């Protein structure tokens, strides 16, 4: 809908931090809205942006697109200002027809959810261990 | 969503001191102009204290003004009033408001507590 | 934020007069926040305009964009409804960079509504004097 | 007016500091004048100028201009005098044309005072959030 | 000498007419200094500027030069504010060289403004009556 | 600052005579600002020049030139006019990085004026005998 | 004359700063006579120079040249010994003919000094301020 | 600095005669039209005389207008008052006054002597 101020509850290895995120406009060539932390120093911010298909009449395939990007901050010593050593990216494409209804986008979205929550994934990725 | 839940509460004697806090989730804390609306027993609303965005310019009424005291803590997202001399009409409800985008507050959100 | 109505108090040289502005959307093809008077004819309206850009591969700086705009309107000799006479304009654009911290950025708007309120600026605008 | 000294109250996000500003004098070639933080060196000073213009053959209407800059200073190891990081940049325009009336122009003056200390314009200009 | 408010009496063809200029600054670029009346919009002000010039590389001469601008102004049919209609002007040059004693020049001033106020420049100015 | 009419005492030979200086302008071509003396006949009068460069925000040497000139008057048998036998020139410049405080400047200014009250330089100047 | 230590007293923004200068000889090459301050590592001493020219029979114009130039220093980190940052120089030239006397010369330099000391030129050098 | 001294001061008897003197730095003397105002030992301020830029134009009131006369020197820039027959009434301090850029003078620069 509207983009309004997202707060995220229970997140991390613990499940104890927020995120809280304000709307940062839509972008006009493309249609991708923003979202973004508010933290000083806008170089070192918790970023996501959502991008969803326009629908027109005659088009095929609906596209949905997730970005996440969290970088970290080094105080360099021998500067004043904290640069980027890292980032840590998320890129997730949802892909549908135009025959396809609703349950069937929820079924697919929750399923992603609960397998994020799964032990297979919090040990893929939080340890970086191949299933095998 | 704008969120308020204040703390403090309390039952106290005649002459004490108290701290009533507020939590203020929900929206960006520091741009806003916050305020303390108290519910008398009776069922009478009286404005409390208004302070501005950075905590500079506070305004009290006259039967407030030398003994209740308001401040910000905006990196806390906390709103504090502290009372003090207590004298028996002090026996209310205590709610936070978050004031309109304007010059003079007219009471937009307001906070269940205490 | 979020637009709501603003009411601007101690307006004028006396300092006694009061101007509400009610909201009126977003622009999503530029971005601009619009506000507005609460009259039937839109040319009478007094307005603001209020928009910010992020960086791109063009600028790399975050711009601020104030703009306000009040019409005058008399009705002439032989007209029945009034007619726009005159526009007063202003136009603020405040520029930074993504290595500014909060506090410069308000240290920098307080300045500008700070110098706004100074003997040599209201005899700047008001008499239409040069500082000599 | 006079190029006097300006002294800033109640500037920053806390509101409690100042500003002092001392005149350098106006430019035979632009016309503007400019004036300059107390204590100093060149090019690590807060700057204002502000100029006004008269019509003529190109232009029928007054312009009034202001015009703050400031820098930041980062000390450097291996130097002892500080460079500049970052500059800060805010410039306004007033355009009057010549039948306008000292009430006109005062209000526009007064209303962008009184809105620049509003919750729009806060979380517009520093934290760069827009408004949704 | 130092700009302060002229005040002019025994104006017009009775002779009992008063007016005040008050000073408006010089003007860096060009060295035209500049007096106008006491009015809001500046489209109806009677002003006066004066400069003088020095010799150059050009002209080899001091060059003294003085113009008087008064509108008249009227609301037409089915108009509020007044409008300027007409435009009375006036343009004195003076010029001397680098040996002239200033008893001359005052001779010259003098004598002018002796000229200004005989039976014959006042019926060939107020009358428009060509000396004959 | 604003240019004033100066008036210098205690000066000559003997520490009596004095130099009184009216404004005559600036050139707007490059911003020199003249004082001359009250004297008829303008090609006779003791002229001094002041010349500061502009601040601009990325200018590395600040400059300040100083110039004197008085002349002699010589009424030749056989002419109505004086002429110039003899000019007297001063030439004082003093230069500044954008680093330099305001009391490494002052110590300059105040320095070079003792050393003129000096009897090596009230020596040099006024008998002239090299030093050795 | 013959060249001595040489102390000024009441020197800076204040008044009370002295500098003590001892003779340092003169160049047999152009007659530059030098005086310079006691101060340990002779790269940063205060230096001035004097230069009058040779008293010919047929020289039609005498010339006398004055020159300061006082250094800053600065312990780099990361080093022994101290450079110099900054530099400030003043450079001033007389010129005379042949048939000016010893009023003349007199009254110049003590007018030079009369201004160094006036609050136009203690305005244009201790805070760059151009006249206008 | 628009600077203004008096000398002559006096005690004198009546019937007498005194030569009030005026200096005027800090401006163009010869531009300007000067004034005589003078202040009673009763603490009241009156008007004596004005003259023009170059000596032309003299005015004085009723009071003055036969035993008082005013001059000017523009190139010693002096101010002079010759004060004659003394009728005991004129036993002020005789203020020198710079007028206004004007047609009839209000004073705004004031020198105090006398």
């Known amino acids: 809908a509207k983009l309004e101020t997202v707060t995220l509850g229970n997140i991390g290895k613990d499940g104890k931090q927020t995120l809280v995120l304000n709307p940062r406009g839509v972008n006009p060539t493309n249609g991708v809205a923003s979202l973004s932390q508010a933290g000083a120093v806008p170089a070192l911010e918790k970023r996501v942006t959502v991008s969803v298909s326009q629908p027109s009449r005659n088009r095929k395939n609906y596209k949905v697109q997730v970005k996440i990007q969290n970088p970290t901050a080094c105080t360099a010593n021998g500067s004043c200002d904290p640069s980027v050593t890292r980032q840590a990216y998320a890129d997730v494409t949802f892909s549908f027809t135009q025959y396809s209804t609703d349950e069937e986008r929820a079924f697919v979205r929750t399923e992603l959810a609960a397998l994020l929550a799964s032990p297979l994934l919090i040990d893929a990725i939080d340890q970086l261990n191949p299933a095998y | 969503e704008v969120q308020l839940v204040e703390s403090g509460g309390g039952l106290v004697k005649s002459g004490g001191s108290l701290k009533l806090s507020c939590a203020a989730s929900?929206?960006?804390?520091?741009?806003?102009?916050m305020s303390w609306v108290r519910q008398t027993p009776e069922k009478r609303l009286e404005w409390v204290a208004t302070?501005?965005?950075?905590?500079?310019?506070?305004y009290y009424p006259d039967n407030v003004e030398g003994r209740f005291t308001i401040s910000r803590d905006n990196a806390k997202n906390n709103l504090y009033l502290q009372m003090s001399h207590l004298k028996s009409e002090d026996t209310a409800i205590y709610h936070c408001?978050?004031?309109?985008?304007?010059?003079?507050?007219?009471?937009?959100?307001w906070g269940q507590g205490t | 934020a979020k637009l709501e109505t603003v009411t601007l108090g101690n307006i004028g040289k006396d300092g006694k007069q009061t101007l509400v502005l009610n909201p009126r959307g977003v622009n999503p093809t530029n971005g601009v926040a619009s506000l507005s008077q609460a009259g039937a004819v839109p040319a009478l309206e007094k307005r603001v305009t209020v928009s910010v850009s992020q960086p791109s591969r063009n600028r790399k700086n975050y711009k601020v964009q104030v703009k306000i705009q009040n019409p005058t309107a008399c009705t002439a000799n032989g007209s029945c409804d009034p007619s726009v006479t005159r526009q007063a304009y202003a136009d603020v654009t405040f520029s930074f960079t993504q290595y500014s911290t909060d506090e410069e950025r308000a240290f920098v708007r307080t300045e500008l509504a700070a110098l706004l309120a100074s003997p040599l600026l209201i005899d700047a605008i008001d008499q239409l004097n040069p500082a000599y | 007016a006079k190029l006097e000294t300006v002294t800033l109250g109640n500037i920053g996000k806390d509101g409690k500091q100042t500003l002092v500003l001392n005149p350098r004098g106006v430019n035979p070639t632009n016309g503007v004048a400019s004036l300059s933080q107390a204590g100093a060196v060149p090019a690590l000073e807060k700057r204002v100028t502000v100029s006004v213009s008269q019509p003529s053959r190109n232009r029928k209407n007054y312009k009034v201009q202001v015009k703050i800059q400031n820098p930041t200073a980062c000390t450097a190891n291996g130097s002892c005098d500080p460079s500049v990081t970052r500059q800060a940049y805010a410039d306004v325009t007033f355009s009057f044309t010549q039948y306008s009336t000292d009430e006109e122009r005062a209000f526009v003056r007064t209303e962008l005072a009184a809105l620049l200390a509003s919750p729009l314009l806060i979380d517009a200009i520093d934290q760069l959030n827009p408004a949704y | 000498a130092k700009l302060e408010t002229v005040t002019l009496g025994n104006i017009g063809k009775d002779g009992k007419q008063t007016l005040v200029l008050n000073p408006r600054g010089v003007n860096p670029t060009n060295g035209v200094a500049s007096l106008s009346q006491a009015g809001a919009v500046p489209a109806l002000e009677k002003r006066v500027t004066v400069s003088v010039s020095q010799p150059s590389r050009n002209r080899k001469n001091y060059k003294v030069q003085v113009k008087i601008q008064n509108p008249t102004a009227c609301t037409a049919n089915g108009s509020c504010d007044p409008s300027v209609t007409r435009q009375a002007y006036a343009d004195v040059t003076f010029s001397f060289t680098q040996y002239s004693t200033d008893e001359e020049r005052a001779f010259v001033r003098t004598e002018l403004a002796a000229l200004l106020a005989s039976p014959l420049l006042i019926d060939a100015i107020d009358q428009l009556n060509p000396a004959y | 600052a604003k240019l004033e009419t100066v008036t210098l005492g205690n000066i000559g030979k003997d520490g009596k005579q004095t130099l009184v200086l009216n404004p005559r302008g600036v050139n707007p071509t490059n911003g020199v600002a003249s004082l001359s003396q009250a004297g008829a006949v303008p090609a006779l009068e003791k002229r001094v020049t002041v010349s500061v460069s502009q601040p601009s925000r990325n200018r590395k040497n600040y400059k300040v030139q100083v110039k004197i000139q008085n002349p002699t008057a010589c009424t030749a048998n056989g002419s109505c006019d004086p002429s110039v036998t003899r000019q007297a020139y001063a030439d004082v410049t003093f230069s500044f990085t954008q680093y330099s405080t305001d009391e490494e400047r002052a110590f300059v200014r105040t320095e070079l004026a003792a050393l003129l009250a000096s009897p090596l330089l009230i020596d040099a100047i006024d008998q002239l005998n090299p030093a050795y | 004359a013959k060249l001595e230590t040489v102390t000024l007293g009441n020197i800076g923004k204040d008044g009370k700063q002295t500098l003590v200068l001892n003779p340092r000889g003169v160049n047999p090459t152009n007659g530059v006579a030098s005086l310079s301050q006691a101060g340990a590592v002779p790269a940063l001493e205060k230096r001035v120079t004097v230069s009058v020219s040779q008293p010919s029979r047929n020289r039609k114009n005498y010339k006398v040249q004055v020159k300061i130039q006082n250094p800053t220093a600065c312990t780099a980190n990361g080093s022994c010994d101290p450079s110099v940052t900054r530099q400030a120089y003043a450079d001033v030239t007389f010129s005379f003919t042949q048939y000016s006397t010893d009023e003349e010369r007199a009254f110049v330099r003590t007018e030079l000094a009369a201004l160094l000391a006036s609050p136009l030129l203690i305005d244009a050098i201790d805070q760059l301020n151009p006249a206008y | 600095e628009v600077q203004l001294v008096e000398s002559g001061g006096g005690l004198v008897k009546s019937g007498g005669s005194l030569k009030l003197s005026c200096?005027?730095?800090?401006?163009?003397?010869?531009?300007?039209?000067?004034?005589?105002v003078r202040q009673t030992p009763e603490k009241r301020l009156e008007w004596?005389?004005?003259?023009?830029?170059?000596?032309?134009?003299?005015?004085?009131?009723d009071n003055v207008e036969g035993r008082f006369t005013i001059s000017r020197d523009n190139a010693k820039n002096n101010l002079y008052l010759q004060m004659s027959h003394l009728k005991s009434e004129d036993t002020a301090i005789?203020?020198?006054?710079?007028?206004?850029?004007?047609?009839?003078?209000?004073?705004?620069?004031?020198?105090?002597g006398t």
């Open positions: 408001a978050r004031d309109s985008s304007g010059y003079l507050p007219y009471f937009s959100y």
């Open positions: 929900g929206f960006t804390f520091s741009s806003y102009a």
């Open positions: 302070i501005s965005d950075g905590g500079r310019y506070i």
